[PDB]
Design a protein around this ligand. Structure first.
Ligand code: CDL
Ligand code: 3PE
Ligand code: 3PE
Ligand code: 3PE
Ligand code: HEC
Ligand code: HEM
Ligand code: HEM
Lengths: 31, 380, 241, 55, 67, 67, 101, 48, 31
C-alpha cells in the first residue's frame, strides 16, 4: 500500500523537475 | 527440544551464522568480504541473464551485445550491473586484501593461501570476461596476452592451439572463452566456501591483534544488521554507478567493433589490471615480465613468512604504518602510470615505482619490524 | 603535430544528474540525419521501431518506413523481390562493403555512427566541436586533395568536407536551421543513438535515490539500537588483592 | 604428532561422510543404485555443459 | 567446539549493560581526535602522490611543447 | 538568409587580452615562417592555444541563443 | 644515553597501546611459545592481563581511549611475561639442539 | 561429409562445381550465381 | 606397452569383421 504511491511520486517529481522535453508533454500536439 | 539445536540444517545455520563467537570490536572493514560474497551472487544473477541472449559468433556477438542493450527490456541495466559490479568487486577485493595486510590477518596461513588462489582465479575471470563483448580493446588485449603466453618456450604453443583453436580468429576461441568464464566463478564460489570453512576453526581477528576470547559476542543480531547495512550501502553505491555514471570507469574505445588491421593509439585494460600492466611497462623482457607479474601477485602468499615482528597488528606499529601507507601510495602511482602512454617521463616513474613497490613489500618491512622490535627492548 | 585539443564543456540540456533529452531536438536531429547526414554514414544498430515514443507517434514514423524503400532480398523464386519498408527494419546502409565505401568516398571509411559518441573521447562535445570547428588550414601543413583541416580530429586532416552551412535544411516545427542549431540537434540525436536508455535510467535513478534515502536511516537506527545495548556497558575489575 | 585425517578442517568432513562412516554389513546391491543415481546426475550436467558451451 | 563455554577463564570481572529501550557534542571531538592521531600517518603519502601526478602532467605537456 | 548565432559569438569575445595576444603571436609565427623558406617548422601549438581559449569563451556563452 | 631515553619515551607515547591501558607484554602476538609462557604465569598476573585485554577490546569498540591521567606510564610498565618467555625460548632451543644431535 | 567416405577430395570438388549455387551480394548489390564448393549444402528443389 | 596394441587390435578385428566394406579397403579404384 506504499510502493505504488512511491513510484508515482518519484515519477511526478521527475516530470516536475524536467518540463518541456519529455515525450509525455507533447501528447496534445499530435494525438 | 528446540529446533535450532536438534535439526541438522538449523544446527549448521546456527553454528556457522548465528551463535558463532565474534570479536566485539571489529570495524566496518570486516564487512567487506561478506560484501564480496554477495557481490559474487550479483554477477551470477547477471550471468544467468547473459546466458539468455548472448551468442558466441563474433560480429553477431557484438550485435547480440547491442541487442541486449536495446531489444531486451532491462537488458542494458543487467549489462551495466555486470560491468560496474566487476568494478565494485575489485574495489571490495582490494580493500579486503588491504585489511589482510594491515591488521595482521595473514598469520592464518591456509586461509591466506585459499585467498590468493581466489585472487588469481578472479583476475583470470575478469580478464576473460573482458574478452567476451568483442571490442577493439578486448581484441588487442586478448592478442597481447596470448602472444605473451606464446612467448614462453614449448609450453604456450599448445595453450594457444587449445585457446585460439585455429589459424586466426574463429568461433571456437569465443566459445571456449565463454565456457571458461561460465565455469570458473563457480570454482570461485567453491573456494569461498573452503575459505569460510578454514576461517571457522580459528575465529575472527580483531583490529588490535590481541586474543579476543575475553570479549566475544554472537554474530546475530549485531553483525547481521551490520552486514545488512553494509549490503544496503554497497547497493546504493553500485546503483549510483549504474544509473547515473554508467561509463566513467569503462574504457570508451571498447564500444566500436574490432578491426585487426588498425592499431589503436592507446591500448588499455580496466583500472584493476592497470598496475599489473605497469609492471608490463617496467622491464623489457617477455618471460621476465611474466615472472615479474606472477611473483608480484605471489609475493602476497610469501608475505606471511616475512613477518619478523613479535606483535601481529600494525595498530601499535607507527613506522610500519608509514611504510604501508607509502605502499598504498606507490600502488596508486602504478595504477595511474598504467593508464598513461609510454613517453617521458612516465617510464622512469613507472620503473622506480615498480622497484620501490618490490622493495617496500619484500626487503624493507623486515628491517622496519626489527627496528620496531629493538625500540621496545625485545630484540637481541 | 600529434598534439590535440580536448573539446570544451558545453552546457547541454542533459548535462545534469536528472536532466532528460530534448525530444523535439531528438526528432530534429533525426531529420538532420535523414536528409543530409545519411549519404555517407550508417546506423546499423538502430531500427525504426525505436523511434516511436521518442521522435514521432505510431503512424508517421511508420510512414518513414515507406519513404526510404528498404529491400529484404531472397525468396523461393530467386528474383529480387521489391517491397516497402516496415517498422521492424533497420536503417539503410549506403554501401554494400567497406572497400566500396573507401573507393567511392576518397579512401576514408565513414564508420558506424550508432556508437560514435560512446566510442570517442569527450562525447557529444567532441561531435559538436568537430562539426562546428571547421577553419582554414594554417601555414606549413600541406594536405593533399580531398582532405580538410580540423584541429579536433586526430592528425588534423578529416576525410569529410563541411556538410552544414546557411539555409541547408528546414524543419517541420519551425526552427531557424543555422549551423549551431543543426550541429546541436544532430549532436543531441546522435547522443541518443548511443543511449536510448537515458530517461528510463534517470527514472530508476531518482527512484533508487528516494528508496535508499528512505530505507537507510531505518537500518541505521536498528543498528544503533542493537549496538547501544552494547555501548552502555561498563566493566569493573575487583581482584582479591 | 596428530592424525591428519581426523584433525584437518576439510578432511574430517570427507572421512566422516565417506571413510569411517559406519554402514550395515548385509547391504545388498540395491542400495548401490542410489550411488549410481548421484553419478548419473553428474554426467547429465556434464553433457548439459557440453550442450550449451559450444552450441 | 569453539562455542560459548570453553573460550577463556575470565575471573572477577563485572559487566553492567542497560536495556536498549531505556536509552553530536561528544562524537565531534572524538572524530577530531581520531583524525588528528591518524593524519600524520595517512596524509603525506597521498600528498606526495598528488605532487608526482601534477609534476608528471606538467613535464608531459612540456615534452609535448616543441619550443 | 539566416545569420548564425555563432559568428556573432566567437567574434564577440575576440577583444580579450589572451585572445588578442594569441592572434598577435599567430601573426608572428605566420610572418616568421613566411620569412624562411627551407625549414620544416610548423605553426600549430599556439593555434591550439588560441582555439582552446576561444572554445572555452564560446562554450561559456552559446547555448541560450539557440532554440 | 639521553638520545635513546627520550626517543624511547616518545616512541612509547606514539605506539598507542598505553592510551588503552596496556603493558608491553599484552601486545605480543600469541604464538605457541607466548601461549606457553602465558600458561606459566601466576593467577593474579593472569587475571590482570585478561582484564586489561578486555578493557582494551571494549575501549576500541567505542573508538575511544582512556583519560590521560590513567594511561600506562613508562616507568610503571612492568615486563612480567619476559622471564617466562625467555625460559620458554631456552627450553625450545635446547629441545631443537637435542633433536639436531 | 562425403570426403573419405564415398568420394575423394577432387571427386567432391567436381560434384560441387557441377552444382550452381545462389550467393550475393557483390560490390554493386546483385544476388548472383557461383559454381559450388564443399561448404555449400544440397540444393533445394522447392524451399516453400 | 599395451595401449597402442589395444587400439591396434581393436581396429584390426574391426576391419577383419568388416573386410571389403570400409573406405580404406576401397581407396584403389575410387582415387
Ligand atoms: C560529519 C558530522 C557528524 C559526525 O561527526 O558523525 C560521526 C559519526 C561517527 O561517530 P562515532 O560515535 O565515533 O561512531 C559510532 C557510532 O555509534 C556509529 O557510527 P559509525 O561511524 O560506527 O557508523 C558505522 C558505519 C558503517 O559503515 C559501513 O558498514 C561501511 C560499509 C561499506 C561502505 C562502502 C564500501 C564500498 C565503497 C566503494 C567506493 O556507517 C557509516 O559509515 C555511515 C552510515 C550512514 C547511514 C545513514 C545515516 C543517515 O559518523 C557517522 O555517524 C557517519 C554518518 C553521519 C555523518
Ligand atoms: C583510508 C583509511 C584511513 C584510516 O582510517 O586509517 C586508519 C586505519 C587504522 O586505524 P587504527 O590503526 O586501527 O587506529 C584506530 C584508532 N585508535 O586504517 C585502516 O583501517 C586501513 C586498513 C586498510 C585499508 C586500505 C587498503 C588500500 C588498498 C590496498 C589494495 C592493494 C593490496 C595489495 C594487492 C597486491
Ligand atoms: C616532538 C613533538 C612532536 C611530536 C609529538 C606531538 C604529536 C604529533 C601528532 C600525533 C601523531 C604522532 O605521534 O605522529 C608520529 C608519527 C610517527 O613517527 P615515527 O614513525 O615514530 O617516526 C617518524 C618517521 N619514522 O610521525 C610521522 O608520521 C611523521 C613522519 C612522516 C613520514 C612520511 C614519509
Ligand atoms: C633516532 C636517533 C635518536 C634520536 C633522538 C631524538 C628524537 C627526538 C626527541 O628527542 O624526541 C623526544 C621529545 C623531545 O625530547 P626531550 O626529552 O624534550 O629532550 C631531551 C633530548 N632527547 O620529547 C617528547 O616529544 C616528549 C614525549 C612525551 C611527552
Ligand atoms: C560523406 C561526404 C560524409 C558526410 C555526408 C558525413 N560524413 Fe562524417 N565522415 C566521412 C568520412 C569519409 C569520415 C572518416 C574521416 C577519416 O579521415 O577517416 C567521417 C568521419 C566522421 C566523424 C569522426 C569519426 C572518427 O573516426 O573520428 C564524425 C564525428 C562524423 N564523421 C560525423 C558526421 C556527421 C554528424 C555527419 C552529418 C552532418 C556526417 N559525418 C556526414 C564522410 C561523411
Ligand atoms: C558464471 C557467471 C558469469 C557469466 C555467465 C558471465 C558472462 C559474461 C558475458 C556473456 C559477458 C559479456 C557481456 C558483457 O560484456 O556485458 C561478460 C562480461 C564481463 N564479465 Fe562476466 N560472467 C560471469 C561472471 C563474472 C564474474 C564473477 C566477473 C568478475 C570477475 C565477471 C566479469 C566480467 C567483466 C569485467 C566483463 C566485461 C564487461 C564489460 O565489457 O564492460 N563476470 N560476462
Ligand atoms: C573472493 C573473494 C573473497 C571472499 C568472498 C572472501 C570472503 C571472506 C569472508 C566472508 C571472511 C570473513 C569475514 C571477514 O573477516 O571479512 C573473510 C576473511 C578473510 N579473508 Fe577473505 N574473501 C575473499 C578474498 C580474499 C582474499 C583474496 C584474501 C587474501 C588476501 C582473503 C583473506 C582473508 C583473511 C586473511 C580473512 C580473515 C580476516 C579476519 O577474519 O579478520 N580473502 N573472507
Amino acid at each position: 500500500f506504499f510502493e505504488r504511491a512511491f513510484d508515482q511520486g518519484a515519477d511526478a517529481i521527475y516530470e516536475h523537475i524536467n518540463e518541456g522535453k519529455l515525450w509525455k508533454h507533447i501528447k496534445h500536439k499530435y494525438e | 527440544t528446540n529446533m535450532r539445536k536438534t535439526h541438522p540444517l538449523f544446527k549448521i545455520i546456527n553454528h556457522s551464522f548465528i551463535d558463532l563467537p565474534a570479536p566485539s570490536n571489529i570495524s566496518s572493514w570486516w564487512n567487506f568480504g561478506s560484501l564480496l560474497g554477495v557481490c559474487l551472487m550479483v554477477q551470477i544473477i547477471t550471468g544467468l541473464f547473459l546466458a539468455m541472449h548472448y551468442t558466441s559468433d563474433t560480429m553477431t556477438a557484438f550485435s547480440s551485445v547491442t541487442h541486449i542493450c536495446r531489444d531486451v527490456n532491462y537488458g542494458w541495466l543487467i549489462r551495466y550491473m555486470h560491468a560496474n559490479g566487476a568494478s565494485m568487486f575489485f574495489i571490495c577485493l582490494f580493500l579486503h586484501v588491504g585489511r589482510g595486510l594491515y591488521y595482521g590477518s595473514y598469520t592464518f596461513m591456509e586461509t591466506w593461501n585459499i585467498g590468493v588462489l581466489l585472487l588469481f582465479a578472479v583476475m583470470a575471470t575478469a580478464f576473460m570476461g573482458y574478452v567476451l563483448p568483442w571490442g577493439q580493446m578486448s581484441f588487442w588485449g586478448a592478442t597481447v596476452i596470448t602472444n605473451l603466453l606464446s612467448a614462453i618456450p614449448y609450453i604456450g604453443t599448445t595453450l594457444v592451439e587449445w585457446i585460439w583453436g585455429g589459424f586466426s580468429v574463429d568461433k571456437a576461441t569465443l566459445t571456449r572463452f565463454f565456457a571458461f568464464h561460465f565455469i570458473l566463478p563457480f570454482i570461485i564460489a567453491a573456494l569461498a566456501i573452503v575459505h569460510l570453512l578454514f576461517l571457522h576453526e580459528t575465529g575472527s581477528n580483531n583490529p588490535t591483534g590481541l586474543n579476543s576470547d575475553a570479549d566475544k559476542i554472537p554474530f546475530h543480531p549485531y553483525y547481521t544488521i551490520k552486514d545488512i547495512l553494509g549490503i544496503l550501502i554497497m547497493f546504493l553505491i553500485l546503483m549510483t554507478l549504474v544509473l547515473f555514471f554508467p561509463d566513467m570507469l569503462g574504457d570508451p574505445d571498447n564500444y566500436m567493433p574490432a578491426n585487426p588491421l588498425n592499431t589503436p593509439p592507446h591500448i588499455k585494460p580496466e583500472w584493476y589490471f592497470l598496475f599489473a600492466y605497469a609492471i608490463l611497462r617496467s622491464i623489457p623482457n617477455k618471460l621476465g615480465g611474466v615472472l615479474a607479474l606472477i611473483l608480484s601477485i605471489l609475493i602476497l602468499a610469501l608475505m606471511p613468512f616475512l613477518h619478523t615482528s613479535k606483535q601481529r597488528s600494525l595498530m601499535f606499529r607507527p613506522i610500519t604504518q608509514i611504510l604501508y601507507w607509502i605502499l598504498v601510495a606507490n600502488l596508486l602511482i602504478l595504477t595511474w602510470i598504467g593508464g598513461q602512454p609510454v613517453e617521458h617521463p612516465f617510464i622512469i616513474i613507472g620503473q622506480l615505482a615498480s622497484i620501490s613497490y618490490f622493495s617496500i613489500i619484500l626487503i624493507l618491512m623486515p628491517i622496519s619490524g626489527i627496528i620496531e622490535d629493538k625500540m621496545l627492548k625485545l630484540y637481541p | 603535430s600529434d598534439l590535440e585539443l580536448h573539446p570544451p564543456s558545453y552546457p547541454w540540456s542533459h548535462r545534469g544528474l536528472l536532466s532528460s533529452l530534448d525530444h523535439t531536438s531528438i526528432r530534429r536531429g533525426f531529420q538532420v540525419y535523414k536528409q543530409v547526414c545519411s549519404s555517407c554514414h550508417s546506423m546499423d544498430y538502430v531500427a525504426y521501431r525505436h523511434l516511436v515514443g521518442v521522435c514521432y507517434t505510431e503512424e508517421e514514423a511508420k510512414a518513414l518506413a515507406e519513404e526510404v524503400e528498404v529491400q529484404d532480398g531472397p525468396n523461393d523464386d530467386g528474383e529480387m523481390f521489391m517491397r516497402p519498408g516496415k517498422l521492424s527494419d533497420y536503417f539503410p546502409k549506403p554501401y554494400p562493403n567497406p572497400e566500396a565505401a573507401r573507393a567511392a568516398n576518397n579512401g576514408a571509411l565513414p564508420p558506424d555512427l550508432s556508437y560514435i559518441v560512446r566510442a570517442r573521447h569527450g562525447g557529444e562535445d567532441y561531435v559538436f566541436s568537430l562539426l562546428t570547428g571547421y577553419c582554414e588550414p594554417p601555414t606549413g601543413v600541406s594536405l593533399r586533395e580531398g582532405l580538410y583541416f580540423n584541429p579536433y580530429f586526430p592528425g588534423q586532416a578529416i576525410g569529410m568536407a563541411p556538410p552544414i552551412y546557411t539555409e541547408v535544411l528546414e524543419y517541420d516545427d519551425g526552427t531557424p536551421a543555422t549551423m549551431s542549431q543543426v550541429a546541436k540537434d544532430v549532436a543531441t540525436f546522435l547522443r541518443w543513438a548511443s543511449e536510448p536508455e537515458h530517461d528510463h535510467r534517470k527514472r530508476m535513478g531518482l527512484k533508487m535515490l528516494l528508496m535508499m534515502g528512505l530505507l537507510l536511516p531505518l537500518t541505521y537506527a536498528m543498528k544503533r539500537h542493537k549496538w547501544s545495548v552494547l555501548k552502555s556497558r561498563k566493566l569493573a575489575y575487583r581482584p582479591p588483592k | 604428532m596428530t592424525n591428519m585425517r581426523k584433525t584437518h578442517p576439510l578432511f574430517k568432513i570427507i572421512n566422516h561422510s565417506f571413510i569411517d562412516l559406519p554402514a550395515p554389513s548385509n547391504i545388498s546391491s540395491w542400495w548401490n543404485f542410489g550411488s549410481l543415481l548421484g553419478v548419473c546426475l553428474m554426467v547429465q550436467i556434464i553433457t548439459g555443459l557440453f550442450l550449451a558451451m559450444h552450441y | 567446539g569453539r562455542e560459548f563455554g570453553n573460550l577463556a577463564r575470565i575471573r572477577h570481572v563485572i559487566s553492567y549493560s542497560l536495556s536498549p529501550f531505556e536509552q553530536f557534542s561528544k562524537g565531534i571531538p572524538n572524530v577530531l581526535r581520531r583524525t588528528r592521531e591518524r593524519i600524520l600517518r595517512v596524509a603525506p603519502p597521498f600528498v606526495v602522490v598528488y605532487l608526482i601526478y601534477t609534476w608528471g602532467n606538467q613535464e608531459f605537456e612540456q615534452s609535448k611543447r616543441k619550443n | 538568409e539566416l545569420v548564425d548565432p555563432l559568428t556573432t559569438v566567437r567574434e564577440h569575445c575576440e577583444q580579450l587580452e589572451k585572445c588578442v595576444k594569441a592572434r598577435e603571436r599567430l601573426e608572428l609565427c605566420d610572418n616568421r615562417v613566411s620569412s624562411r623558406s627551407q625549414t620544416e617548422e610548423d605553426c600549430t601549438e599556439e593555434l591550439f592555444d588560441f582555439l582552446h581559449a576561444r572554445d572555452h569563451c564560446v562554450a561559456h556563452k552559446l547555448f541560450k541563443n539557440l532554440k | 644515553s639521553k638520545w635513546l631515553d627520550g626517543f624511547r619515551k616518545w616512541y612509547y607515547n606514539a605506539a598507542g597501546f598505553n592510551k588503552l591501558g596496556l603493558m608491553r607484554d599484552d601486545t605480543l602476538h600469541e604464538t605457541e611459545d607466548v601461549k606457553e609462557a602465558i600458561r606459566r604465569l601466576p593467577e593474579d598476573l593472569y587475571n590482570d592481563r585478561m582484564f586489561r585485554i578486555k578493557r582494551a577490546l571494549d575501549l576500541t569498540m567505542r573508538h575511544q581511549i582512556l583519560p590521560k591521567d590513567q594511561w600506562t606510564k613508562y616507568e610503571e610498565d612492568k615486563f612480567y611475561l619476559e622471564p617466562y618467555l625467555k625460559e620458554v625460548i631456552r627450553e625450545r632451543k635446547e629441545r631443537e639442539e637435542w633433536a639436531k644431535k
